[PDB]
Amino acid sequence: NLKIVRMDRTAGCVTGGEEIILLCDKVQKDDIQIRFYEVWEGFGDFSPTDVHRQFAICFKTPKYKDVNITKPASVFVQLRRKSDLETSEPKPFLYYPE
Amino acid sequence: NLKIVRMDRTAGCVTGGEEIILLCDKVQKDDIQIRFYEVWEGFGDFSPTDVHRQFAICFKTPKYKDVNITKPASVFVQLRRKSDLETSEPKPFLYYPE
Numbered sequence A, B: 001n002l003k004i005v006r007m008d009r010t011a012g013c014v015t016g017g018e019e020i021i022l023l024c025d026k027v028q029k030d031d032i033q034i035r036f037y038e039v040w041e042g043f044g045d046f047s048p049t050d051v052h053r054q055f056a057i058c059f060k061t062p063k064y065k066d067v068n069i070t071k072p073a074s075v076f077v078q079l080r081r082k083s084d085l086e087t088s089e090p091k092p093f094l095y096y097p098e
Helices: none
Strands: A004-007 A011-013 A019-024 A033-037 A041-043 A056-060 A073-080 A091-096 B004-007 B011-013 B019-024 B033-037 B041-043 B056-060 B073-080 B091-096
Touching (some): B004 B073
Parallel strands (some): A011 A091, B011 B091
Antiparallel strands (some): A019 A056, A033 A073, B004 B019, B033 B041, B073 B091
């Protein structure tokens, strides 16, 4: 089962598109997503080639639901397997205004 | 043989101590170093537990040789095996003034 071991950033701008490196326990590159949620949900933008040897993922943050927030919005991020929707424990993530 | 596949930062402040995540091809956690060089050399600060499943390394940058530079200093970074001193191809890295 799924685990986010580390992320180099736990915050990002509401506009999205910012690169993060996430370290995970073993995943399958074609059966993995990164889900940001609050239910609002957005997905990390990456392809299977951005999964590094099943143990890391380089991705770009999704745009948050509201790019006009005036203060930070606390969300969660989890790994999720596409096939059976199994998830990791969530990590907090802070979206901040532009 | 050794390869730096990606680093989340390719620059840092001369004072060192900044966290980087490096993605690499397979290493042994007890037989790996990260060497910054220009011969001046400094080493990434990490322990074997900071090596993630042999495919990534979380480390802190070394302090540069001169913390009083007034413009950026271009150095190289390589993986190096401690046992036999085998190295990866170098990646450029820019140190910048405080």
